[model samples]
Target chain A: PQITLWQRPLVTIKIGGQLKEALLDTGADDTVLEEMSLPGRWKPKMIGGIGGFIKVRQYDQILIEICGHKAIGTVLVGPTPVNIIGRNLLTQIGCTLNF
Target chain B: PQITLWQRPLVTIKIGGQLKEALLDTGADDTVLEEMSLPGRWKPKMIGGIGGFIKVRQYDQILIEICGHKAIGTVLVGPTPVNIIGRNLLTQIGCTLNF
Candidate 1:
């Protein structure tokens, strides 16, 4: 017998003013924004992570629009140095993993 | 109209090499560390925000030990300009918010 695996559609999003592109990981649970990519007037709140919580400020309710999509949601901002998208925003938009 | 408000148990965690104290917010979705509080060997990856994505780096899976707890998980590090705890680590610990 043979088995098949499922895959979800990956959306390409432009980042920064330079239009840098990244694969949209809907499996991510948190809506993450890059600190260096943030524009003026946007401040992020520092919140806890998976291992443990840290003390820092975080930005709340940032206005984000997906490519060809208009629904903007509140995303938590993460620091730059290690970049990975989580499931914060995807859950709000009703996205599920195909695998 | 009138409404009822609720509150949850906040845990106190020590931060930085100096062990600064901070409250644990169960509502946060990502693990965050203060940029200045990191001990060393931790880097951050910058991603997109609610408004748009930016180009920056982020740190992953920093070793964090909660007081009296032994379970450690992977976490996304965010920048610190504002400080607030979210639900990232809470859910991993199977914590619940109380009213």
Candidate 2:
């Protein structure tokens, strides 16, 4: 199935057993969530974005469903201004720039 | 012409007589440049992102060329870590999210 997104590609997704709205940020390298609870020992990492850098908790091997397309990958939970769906998951959904 | 982009859709563009590399950020509402000197009357605007909001200078009616497609629109210049090609110009080039 093919889906067309708007300029500000915002979509709803369920992760960590919860639903979240995330912006499709192709420029971002990894997925970032405003807040989420992931069990187990997760690694801590820092990511830079439009404003600056922020520290986050990285939980690996997490399954996230974007537009009904499920992709299992690393998920970052932090104090991001907004939730962002980055390249890590976009690749799994076969998303690309169309002109 | 259709051009497929990678996860991190980074591309080179020419704006204000200067060539710069910018990330194709579909989630961004406006085109943001790291730095550009635009003469004439301009206004100051603020934009928010993953990290936070930043002050920027908005120059209207500026021409930018992205992948051989020319677009004339408002360009925001600010202290950003990376230049971003937002939807304002993407629509002009007929760019969309493809899966």
Candidate 3:
């Protein structure tokens, strides 16, 4: 899939049996999802970004379907303007930047 | 250029005659640079992201060279962890997401 930068590079993502839209964020180191519930033990952590930092729950070894591609990795659940699919999960699906 | 997700997709960017490293962020709508001085009249603006919102100075029609490709767009100056080249500038350089 070749996605132009003309608009937000948002794609369908399925997590926890729920379908949602997420942006493929290259700048973010970890994948961050909006407030949601996930089964399993999670650790409290803080992640920083452009504005500042926010406390989040870190869930590891989570299965996520990004653009129909299956990927498993650590996902941070917290308050965010939108769902961000970062490099941590992106790499698992062989995502890349091209020009 | 094809950049794998194995590493941060950072590239050399020339802005205000200064060379710096920036991430090609498809998730960010506007480019945000670390605290720096640029010659021009800028207006105070606020931008929000993963964590929260931050105040910045907006400099419009600024020339930036990303990966040797010239681009001109609105650049925000603020306290960011890293310099980000958002879709605003990425589009100018014909950047795209591929998988």
Candidate 4:
């Protein structure tokens, strides 16, 4: 699928048997989601961005389906305004930037 | 050009006769650059992200050459770890997501 930049590159994602919309953020190094409950032990971590840094729980080996493509990667759970699907998962889903 | 997600989609941008590397950030709504001086009267503004919000100076109608393609749009100047070319400018460059 080819998505034009006329709008935010947002797509439906399925995680933990729940459907959510996430941004395909090419600038982010890791995937970060709004706080949610997930199975398994998570380590406390922090991620920095344009504004500043925030504490988050790192959940590894998480299964997520983006645009119907399945990918397993690390997902950070924390207080975020939006759900971001970063390069970590974008690579697995074979997403690319074209001009 | 097609850029894979295996690595950061960093591109050389020429602005104000200066060459700098910036990421094509689909997640960011507006372009944000590390503190830099641009010619014009700018207004103080703020932008938010995964972490929080930060104060920035907004410069409009700035011409930026991204990957040899030129685009003029609003550019925010602030303290950022990396320079980001967001959707505002990416659209002008005709960038898109392909999977």
Candidate 5:
């Protein structure tokens, strides 16, 4: 599927059995989600972007479904202003930049 | 032409007679450049992203060449951490998100 790029590059994604909007951020390496309750114990880590590095809970092997495509990758939970789907998950779904 | 999305979506863009690297950011509305001197007078404005809003010098109709495509549109100047090619410029060059 071809998605038109909007001002915010917003995309709807399904994760944790729920649907949510996320920013299609090619600028980020790791996918980050807004703070929410996820299963099990995860390791705490710091990731850098935008203003500075922030604390986050990195959960491994999280399954995310976007536009009918399934992608299992790392999901970071933090106080992020928005949810970002980065290159990790983007490649899983064969996303690319076409001009 | 199709370009692969890197982790940071870094792209080599030609602007102001020099080639520089910029992030292909769909999350931003307007293009932002690192502190640099542009010709003529520009209006002062504020743009929001990442952490919060920041003041910038708004210059219009500036020519930018990304890859092999040329885009002439609004370019914002400020103390940005990285140069961003937003949707405004991306549209001018027929850029899109394809999966």
Candidate 6:
């Protein structure tokens, strides 16, 4: 029997001056923003969602290029330890994952 | 032979009215926001950085609580399939991994 490695379609985003790729997912319901790449004094207002509401402080905007298309937007700066490509951008590009 | 499983600390954030937990990572540089969780017609200004500058056209905010500490901030919404916790908030809590 041969083992197969499961791979999903990854979308690339530029972070910290680098082009990084991530698996595109549709099941996700919200966008997750990492905090390291953002500036120190950037803060935005907190909003409420299905999980109730929490407050987010800090703001840093960056240019995001996905599938050769790019967009610049403000990201909620969190102490996220890794970079993630979430559902927020997926719908905009009209993309779907083939698992 | 002994096999060891690597585990990292996970922080929870509220998205779409749900309390979700995620692994705490120190290597990630930026915060990612999911697009689906955001409200309607949110757009923000775009900024520039290493991968060049792109324009972002959405704005929505959420509340985040890590290790019991919470903050309200804005997030750059993307189309992430899942939720992740990154380094930006990890350093703020003064935490380290015990591997």
Pick the DockQ winner.
4
Q: Is candidate 3 or candidate 5 better by DockQ?
A: 3
| DockQ for each model | 0.03, 0.62, 0.85, 0.87, 0.59, 0.02
Q: Would you list the rank order by DockQ, best first?
A: 4, 3, 2, 5, 1, 6
Residue pairs in clash, model 4: none
Provide the lDDT at B68 for model 4: 91
| TM, every model | 0.34, 0.90, 0.96, 0.97, 0.89, 0.34
- Chain A only: list TM-scores of all candidates: 0.47, 0.89, 0.97, 0.97, 0.93, 0.51
- Model 4, C-alpha of A51: deviation from truth (Å): 1.6
Better of 2 and 4 by lDDT: 4
Docking class of 2: medium
lDDT of 4 by residue, A1-99 (tens): 998887888899999789999998899889999889888999999999866789999999999999899999999999888899999999998899999
**Top-scoring candidate (TM-score):** 4
Model 2 lDDT per residue over A1-99, tens place: 333444468889988788888888777788888866777678989987766778999989988899889999998999987888888888888887877
Give per-residue lDDT, candidate 2, residue B27: 72
Report, for every candidate in turn, its global Cα lDDT versus the true structure: 0.39, 0.81, 0.90, 0.92, 0.84, 0.44
Task: Residues B14-95, candidate 4: write the lDDT tens digits.
Answer: 9989999999999888999999889999999999875678899999999999989999999999988889899999999999
Q: Which clashing pairs does model 2 show?
A: none
Q: Candidate 5 regions off by >4 Å?
A: none
lDDT of 2: 0.81
Give stretches of model 4 more than 4 Å off: none
For residues A1-99, write the lDDT of model 3, one tens digit per residue.
989989898899999999999989888889999999999999999998766789999999999999889999999999888889999998888888988
Model 6 residue B85 distance off true place after TM-score fit, in angstroms: 20
Poorest stretch of ten by lDDT in candidate 3 chain B: B47-56
- lDDT for predicted candidate 6 compared with the true structure: 0.44
**In model 5, what are the clashing residue pairs, if there are any?**
none
Arrange candidates by lDDT, descending: 4, 3, 5, 2, 6, 1
Better of 2 and 6 by TM-score: 2
Those runs of model 2 whose alpha carbons end farther than 4 Å from true positions after fitting are: A1-7, B1-7
Q: Is candidate 3 or 6 superior in lDDT?
A: 3
lDDT tens readout by residue for model 5, B16-38: 89889998877667789998988
